[PDB]
Design a protein around this ligand. Sequence first.
Ligand SMILES: Nc1nc2c(ncn2[C@@H]2O[C@H](COP(=O)(O)OP(=O)(O)O)[C@@H](O)[C@H]2O)c(=O)[nH]1
Ligand SMILES: [Mg+2]
Lengths: 386, 181
Amino acid sequence: TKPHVNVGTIGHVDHGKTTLTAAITTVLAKTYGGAARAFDQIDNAPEEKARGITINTSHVEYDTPTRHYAHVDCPGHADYVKNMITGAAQMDGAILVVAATDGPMPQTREHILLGRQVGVPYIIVFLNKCDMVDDEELLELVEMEVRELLSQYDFPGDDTPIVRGSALKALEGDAEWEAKILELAGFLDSYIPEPERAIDKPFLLPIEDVFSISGRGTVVTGRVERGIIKVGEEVEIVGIKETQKSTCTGVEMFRKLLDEGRAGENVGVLLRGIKREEIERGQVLAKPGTIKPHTKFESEVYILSKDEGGRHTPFFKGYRPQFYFRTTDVTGTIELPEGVEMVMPGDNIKMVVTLIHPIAMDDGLRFAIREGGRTVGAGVVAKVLG
Amino acid sequence: SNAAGKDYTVIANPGKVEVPGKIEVREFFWYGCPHCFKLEPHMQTWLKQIPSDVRFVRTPAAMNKVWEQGARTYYTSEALGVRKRTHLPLFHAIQVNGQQIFDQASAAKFFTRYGVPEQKFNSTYNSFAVTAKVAESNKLAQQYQLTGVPAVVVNGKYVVQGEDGKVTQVLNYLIEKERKA
Ligand SMILES: Nc1nc2c(ncn2[C@@H]2O[C@H](COP(=O)(O)OP(=O)(O)O)[C@@H](O)[C@H]2O)c(=O)[nH]1
Ligand SMILES: [Mg+2]
């Protein structure tokens, strides 16, 4: 029952992300024992290319005595951008690799910025290639540059753990450098808080459908995304129409009525005082006062290439697509960064979006952009505005 | 032995292959079938050395509601681009372990282990595209007059049954036979 933490490496090309990844797994395996390996033989049958975002990712797993880590690394900057905006696993923490020999480089900055935008909660720094530097004053200068860069994007640069190491020497089994990998793993253990379990968060249910029941009453269905709903508790119905308040009078599962519904379950929720016409797909049920409806937000967006089955042509400032949040589409207009007139297939940009009606949302919520139900883009709410 | 009507059968109403220019090899199977599972390592070692002029495709059986669920799961994994990662462990999970992955909900749960969100699994499972695949699967099976699984159909005109290396031996004979006109 070792807590599960998702992490990944970020930083500029050639700074050592792949070597560090291999070094962490090797050292931790030889020190604490390797992670449990599951069945995962790969099908030799040829696989035709399918529509959708293509993301090159490597995954490994490694354990410390108290934690289990799932670790993602990518070959190139384009892959990091996609994975951070819309990659299969949201990082609980990132390891920023910076080569002491270069100091912070353009993709060092870009990855930290992206990190702030998509909500990476924590960043730990591995100052790599220290085997090439005999010059403590230079190491201190590079660390100061890194801390100042982090703080520029509101990461706590002064409080950030920074490990001085060599991924390559550690991978090659040099004991002195292996110790720096253990130090890094120590900071993954102590600096990244155990992530909050879904069942422990305030109740939230994305409404998939609405039915009449008991003659005049109403039941809404969906999957409990987080928390617990119990009969007798009040809920707010948030988004699209004016926020309403109701009381849960039953949780419907199959052909019975239960006293509660928990995160992960598919349930119907009976609501007091709610007419069928007053509630619709795409609204959410939520613990009162824990999520608000917004129409305007800042986001970071990746636009699919033609090869990924997205748009064939660029769009301009007047573009008006469908934004898909949880369970429904909502039309909205966009503002591009100044200086930017059009957006090409394959681009990523900051986009200011104004929806035609409000949607329940917080910072960090992911969404798709679609044309006729076909995905042409993927985004994340960076900052809610109104 | 490689004799027509004994080691393989000639399809009465032969079909035209999906992709012109390649020799089609098409496997009909169900994840729930132990005989399919016994065939699989033989198919796997045969796949390692696919000739450049043959195309191999799996067409999961879907003639009934039970097998259709496996069939939808498969086409879904292909739709999402993860079949190469999921196919053998899914097969292993069901056949070696005792996992009950025989419906939409438990398949979705299984696929979270491979990054796939349940909402995306669910929209795909019942999408028109997957449903079209299911229909095509059933169309071929009725035309080729398959009564069950496993079955490997070559260039839409020969059926090979069995669950061991004899299958891939007869396939190679048929593949080479096609190569002449
Ligand atoms: N001298 C030295 N070379 C390193 C170190 N880490 C990585 N390298 C080398 O730097 C190059 C880039 O490494 P790689 O991990 O693939 O960079 P990535 O693009 O960030 O994944 C490779 O040739 C590595 O062998 C290190 O700690 N010391
Ligand atoms: Mg690399």
